[PDB]
């Protein structure tokens, strides 16, 4: 079966782990344990295709930024996550995309921009602002809540659909 190597990236605290764990394990992680780098692997059927998803849940803590090159080299598609209640995290996306672009020497890397924590009302990043950023990268923008599971499958399975278009 086809394996998809997905990598979840973005600033600390944006919900990368909660998103991944919601997808793979169907519960919401309420606590905040910063990640170094974790791997998850699950067989799923996406659009009739039995798929192995290999998901790398990466560090948002800037102290671990030296690890980015390695994971950007091996990843096939990237979920670029910010939180809609964290303007800085949205502004941080570009450093992630620019590095992905550099490492893969490509302006056409499979990516999805994810505005997470869409269950929270303290929104400082409007959907349209994020749509505009995604448009500039040629990628979809999807809002998610790891808490309620809104958009979670859509974000990941879409990443897959973007990889398939490559």
Ligand X SMILES: Nc1nc2c(ncn2[C@@H]2O[C@H](COP(=O)(O)OP(=O)(O)NP(=O)(O)O)[C@@H](O)[C@H]2O)c(=O)[nH]1
117 binds, among ligand X, Mg ion, Ca ion, none (CB under 5 to 8 A by kind): ligand X
Q: What angle do CA 122, 145, 34 make, to 5 degrees?
A: 85
Burial of 13 per CB tally in 10 Å (0-12, 13-18, 19+): middle
What residue ranges bind Mg ion (CB under 5 A)? 16-17, 35
- For the CB of residue 119, give the shortest distance to ligand X in the complex, in Å: 5
Q: Which is nearer to Ca ion, 64 or 104 (CB)?
A: 104
Nearest alpha-carbon partner for 93 in 56, 59, 133: 133
- For the CB of residue 45, give the shortest distance to Mg ion in the complex, in Å: 27
Give the tokens for residue 152.
């979670």
Nearest alpha-carbon partner for 16 in 54, 60, 52, 73: 60
Q: Which is nearer to ligand X, 86 or 133 (CB)?
A: 86
- For the CB of residue 137, give the shortest distance to Ca ion in the complex, in Å: 5
Please give the annotated binding residues, written as ranges.
13-18, 29-35, 59-60, 116-119, 145-147
Please give the annotated binding residues for GTP, written as ranges.
13-18, 29-35, 59-60, 116-119, 145-147
């Amino acid at each position: 079966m086809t394996e998809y190597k997905l990598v979840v990236v973005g600033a600390g605290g944006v919900g990368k782990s909660a998103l991944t764990i919601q997808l793979i394990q169907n519960h919401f992680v309420d606590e905040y344990d910063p990640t170094i780098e974790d791997s998850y692997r699950k067989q799923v059927v996406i659009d009739g295709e039995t798929c192995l998803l290999d998901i790398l849940d990466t560090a948002g803590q800037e102290e671990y930024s030296a690890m980015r090159d390695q994971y950007m080299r091996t990843g096939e598609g990237f979920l670029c996550v910010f939180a809609i209640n964290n303007t800085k995290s949205f502004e941080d996306i570009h450093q992630y995309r620019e590095q992905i672009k550099r490492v893969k020497d490509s302006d056409d890397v499979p990516m999805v921009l994810v505005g997470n924590k869409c269950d929270l009302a303290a929104r400082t990043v409007e959907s349209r602002q994020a749509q505009d950023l995604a448009r500039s990268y040629g990628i979809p923008y999807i809002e998610t809540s790891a808490k309620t599971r809104q958009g979670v499958e859509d974000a990941f399975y879409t990443l897959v659909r973007e990889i398939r278009q490559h």
